[PDB]
């Protein structure tokens, strides 16, 4: 019988399924639910369907998952809403890519950078009927490096999320894991409508903030930000003082400072 | 000769000047530059002009202060741009109402609450040619309590600001203080144009965040926020689950929750 379902995508889904098959369940005891854009081709991330092809793991639909009493269900970067009322099983887990209770919702590779954080996290939680509201099982807090793009923070979510999955899976299978209610204080949330790539950069800000407004949108597979109609592939914040409110376009880059005068190098796409 | 000038307003300016007169300098060695809002009338804060009147302290212009060699210049809630480059003296100090390098600029009773902080601070710093950018001398970080309004936060800034002034003024007079360059990382800035004090509440947020959007604008001498054209005087957030995205209007209050379902009581004026 199916004991465990992985729903989602990318190295976190693939490497977590590999760990299950090495350590916990036989191929016939596991199923995958792919994202809508998985076409079995490994690229900047591994394809869950390609892993399932090589390893003869079966696919189920979300509607089939609903009916399997006792299944352990994990969303790992899943692209569909998990409706807890629809499931017979109450063993439903999500790896949310933030330090809950902060940054519930979407685009968590963008929102902590845009909001001037120097740390993020991954949180393994129970799925309940709210958006990323369920009880925490475990959390890993880690730094946002000063020149990380959204893409760099995303790759860190994938690594630490895989780490939390492997750390907690035995206690989840044994049903010996502890879970705690999320705090109401410091709880934050961003919807799709709260993120706008086309939003003009506000230059009447610190160098840190101008740099954040650029690098939060650097994720080349999805998009790059623009300055004066040129795409930017990298932003570098220095602590060199070059004077307040500087802006100079060079052949390959922009030199920028905000209200505190620290030099930003914004590298042009070429 | 004038040894010290206090430029600014409110209890922080008046209490700091009193401390100077009791502990450091004679009335004829001090001057004030009041804010444009100072009409010499005590209200919900004391008037610096009124104190100066009663204590025979001279009012000078900013242009005069620029030409006074050796003056200690202290901005405490001053309402004009000060830039070292204009002054003969280099002894220029500001009490900024945030935990610098965060929340440079204005409306710092609003910005930390609105940006989901649980702490703020006061920072004694050197004034340079940028906005709240000069080297840090001392800092005191204190909690934002969960139901604090902008008004509660402002009164804490006045209190902790006065504390940091009295702690540091002897070493500033003796020129034995240390200063440190502000970090480039975590530096943030808000201008007058970045805050709409007619803030429209985004309800597609957590209870903590809805509560923040209300309480950040509760400062009755300036404004109260409105829900459904009704002024709000108090917001109270608890960890009681009442359901997601609740909004119930009672005669005297609103019970509200955001995406995470925690109870807010917003009390009507």
Nearest to A259 among B131, B193, B206 (CB): B131
Total residues found in chain A within this entry = 270
Distance CA B102, CA B114 (A): 13
Cα–Cα distances (Å) from A210 to A104, A124, A147, B108, in that order, read 24, 32, 12, 20
Distance from CA of B217 to the nearest CA of A (A): 19
| Separation between Cα atoms, residue A3 and residue A73, nearest integer Å | 9
Of B146, B187, B259, the CB nearest to A189: B259
d(CA B13, CA B76): 6
Q: How far apart are CA A34 and CA A65, in angstroms?
A: 13
Closest among A50, A45, A15, A22 to A34, alpha carbons compared:
A50
CA distance A17 to A3: 13
Which chain B residues contact residue A209 at CB under 8 A? 187-189
Which residues, 6 or more positions from B232, have their beta carbon under 8 angstroms from its beta carbon?
B214, B218, B224, B225, B226, B254, B266, B267, B268, B269
Taking the CB of residue A229, how many other CB atoms lie within 10 A of it?
5
Would you give the distance in Å from CA B32 to the centre of its chain?
19
d(CA B248, CA A113): 35
Distance from CA of B185 to the nearest CA of A (A): 6
Taking an 8 Å cut-off on Cβ atoms, the answer to whether B206 and A183 are in contact is no
Residues of A with CB under 8 A from a CB of B: 101-102, 104-105, 115-116, 118, 129-131, 133, 146, 182-189, 191, 193-194, 202, 204-209, 237-239, 244, 258-262
Instruction: Check the CA dihedral A16-A18-A20-A24 and report its sign.
Output: negative
Q: How was this structure determined?
A: X-ray
CA nearest B245: which of B195, B200, B192, B209?
B209
The rounded distance, in Å, linking the Cα atoms of A147 and B33 is 43
From chain B, pick out residues whose CB is under 8 angstroms from the CB of A105: 259
Tell how strand A72-76 and strand A4-8 pair up. parallel
Q: Nearest to residue B78, comparing CAs of B109, B34, B20, B40?
A: B34
Coil, helix or strand for B114?
A: helix
Burial of A120 (0-12, 13-18, 19+ CB in 10 A): buried
CA–CA separation, A97 vs A37, rounded Å? Answer: 20
Instruction: Residue count of chain B, please give it.
Output: 269
Residue that is written with structure tokens 């902590």 in the block: A112
Minimum distance, in Å, between the CA of residue B259 and any CA atom of chain A: 7
Residue B86, class by beta-carbon neighbours within 10 Å (0-12 exposed, 13-18 middle, 19+ buried)? Answer: middle
What is residue A160's three-state secondary structure?
helix
Domain boundaries of chain A, sorted by first residue: 1-270
Neighbours of A85 (CB within 10 A): 6
What letters, b where the CB count within 10 A reaches 16 and e where it falls short, cover B193-207? ebbeeebebeebbbb
CA distance A255 to chain B (A): 16
Residues 6+ apart with CB under 8 A from B143: B118, B119
């Amino acid at each position: 019988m199916i004991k465990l379902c992985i729903a989602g995508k990318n190295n976190i889904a693939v490497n977590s399924l590999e760990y299950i098959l090495k350590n916990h369940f036989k191929p016939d005891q596991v199923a995958v639910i792919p994202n809508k854009n998985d076409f079995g081709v490994d690229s900047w991330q591994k394809s869950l369907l390609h892993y399932a092809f090589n390893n003869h793991i079966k696919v189920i639909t979300l509607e089939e998952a609903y009916e399997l009493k006792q299944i352990i269900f994990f969303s790992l970067e899943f692209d569909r809403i998990v409706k807890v009322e629809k499931f017979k099983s109450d063993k439903l887990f999500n790896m949310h890519f933030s330090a809950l209770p902060k940054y519930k919702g979407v685009f968590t590779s963008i929102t902590p950078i845009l909001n001037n954080e120097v740390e993020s996290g991954v949180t393994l939680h129970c799925i309940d009927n709210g958006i990323d509201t369920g009880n925490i099982i475990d959390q890993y807090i880690f730094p946002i490096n000063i020149n990380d793009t959204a893409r760099d923070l995303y790759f860190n979510y994938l690594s630490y999320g895989e780490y939390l999955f492997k750390k907690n899976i035995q206690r989840i299978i044994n049903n010996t894991y502890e879970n705690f209610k999320q705090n109401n204080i410091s709880s934050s949330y961003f919807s799709r409508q709260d993120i706008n790539i086309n939003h003009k950069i506000n230059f009447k800000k610190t160098s840190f903030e101008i740099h954040n407004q650029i690098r939060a949108f650097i994720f080349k597979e999805y998009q790059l930000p623009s300055i004066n109609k040129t795409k930017i592939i990298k932003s570098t914040l220095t602590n060199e003082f070059i004077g307040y409110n500087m802006f100079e376009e060079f052949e390959e880059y922009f030199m920028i400072s905000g209200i505190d005068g620290f030099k930003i190098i914004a590298q042009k796409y070429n």
